[PDB]
């Protein structure tokens, strides 16, 4: 959760926001949401 | 601006200063808005911007 929050913080302060797609131009990423909203399999991106 | 993310916003800032030489009152404005700070001075005073 910490690792996610740190990755999310850096992005949100660089003006990135939540959205369905991963767009470099529009500054959007679907993972810019609380770690609690991730499924157990999705949480493996950080736990593994 | 509150919660501003650093110099990400590319906007200029304008600050204005007003002085009254007959009453000794100095005030400031920012972007056309008033400010709560003010100063009072005694007669026969010299000031430099």
Curated annotation (Swiss-Prot), chain A:
Coiled coil: none
PTM: Channel activity is modulated by phosphorylation.
Annotated compartments: Sarcoplasmic reticulum membrane
Protein family according to the UniProt entry: Belongs to the ryanodine receptor (TC 1.A.3.1) family. RYR1 subfamily.
Annotated function: Cytosolic calcium-activated calcium channel that mediates the release of Ca(2+) from the sarcoplasmic reticulum into the cytosol and thereby plays a key role in triggering muscle contraction following depolarization of T-tubules. Repeated very high-level exercise increases the open probability of the channel and leads to Ca(2+) leaking into the cytoplasm. Can also mediate the release of Ca(2+) from intracellular stores in neurons, and may thereby promote prolonged Ca(2+) signaling in the brain. Required for normal embryonic development of muscle fibers and skeletal muscle.
Subunit annotation: Homotetramer. Can also form heterotetramers with RYR2. Identified in a complex composed of RYR1, PDE4D, PKA, FKBP1A and protein phosphatase 1 (PP1). Repeated very high-level exercise decreases interaction with PDE4D and protein phosphatase 1 (PP1). Interacts with CALM; CALM with bound calcium inhibits the RYR1 channel activity. Interacts with S100A1. Interacts with FKBP1A; this stabilizes the closed conformation of the channel. Interacts with CACNA1S; interaction with CACNA1S is important for activation of the RYR1 channel. Interacts with CACNB1.
Domain-level remarks: The calcium release channel activity resides in the C-terminal region while the remaining part of the protein constitutes the 'foot' structure spanning the junctional gap between the sarcoplasmic reticulum (SR) and the T-tubule. Pore opening is mediated via the cytoplasmic calcium-binding domains that mediate a small rotation of the channel-forming transmembrane regions that then leads to channel opening.
Protein's name in the database: Ryanodine receptor 1
Origin species: Sus scrofa (Pig)
GN (gene name): RYR1
Residues of the full protein shown: 2761 to 2808 of 5035
